[PDB]
């Protein structure tokens, strides 16, 4: 039932009691490591999009 | 994996020239897509977690 806590509303209530403004922190230093990884991947899937348009 | 904005312009000389400074651009909104599931298998219970599990099972009675 949708009464019951989803483990992200938990995980919330978890990190308000023991990190409510560090959680940005760890955001931001984990995000520094996601963003230049898709971007990454999003760049290689564009040249090979580009590529594929140019085989065709 | 983030979005991949539709081909503006056929043409590699101009449109995919402005196409590159659009979705590689400073500004940009990067749209977030997910990959395509793959197929995870069931994680194996650690027989602690069982000896967790099993002690609630019984406190039921």
Redesign the interface.
């Given at each position: 039932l949708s009464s019951i806590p989803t483990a992200l509303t938990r995980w919330t209530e978890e990190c308000k009691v023991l990190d409510a403004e560090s959680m940005h922190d760890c955001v931001s230093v984990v995000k520094v490591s996601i963003?230049n990884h898709?971007?990454f991947?999003?760049?290689e899937?564009?040249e090979e999009?580009?590529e594929k348009?140019?085989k065709q | 994996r983030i979005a991949l904005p539709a081909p503006r312009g056929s043409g590699t000389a101009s449109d995919d020239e402005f196409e590159n400074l659009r979705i590689k651009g400073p500004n940009a909104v990067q749209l977030v897509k997910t990959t395509p599931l793959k197929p995870s298998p069931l994680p194996v219970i650690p027989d602690t977690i069982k000896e967790v599990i099993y002690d609630m099972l019984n406190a039921l009675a």
């Open positions: 963003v898709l971007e991947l999003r760049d899937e564009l999009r580009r348009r140019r | -």
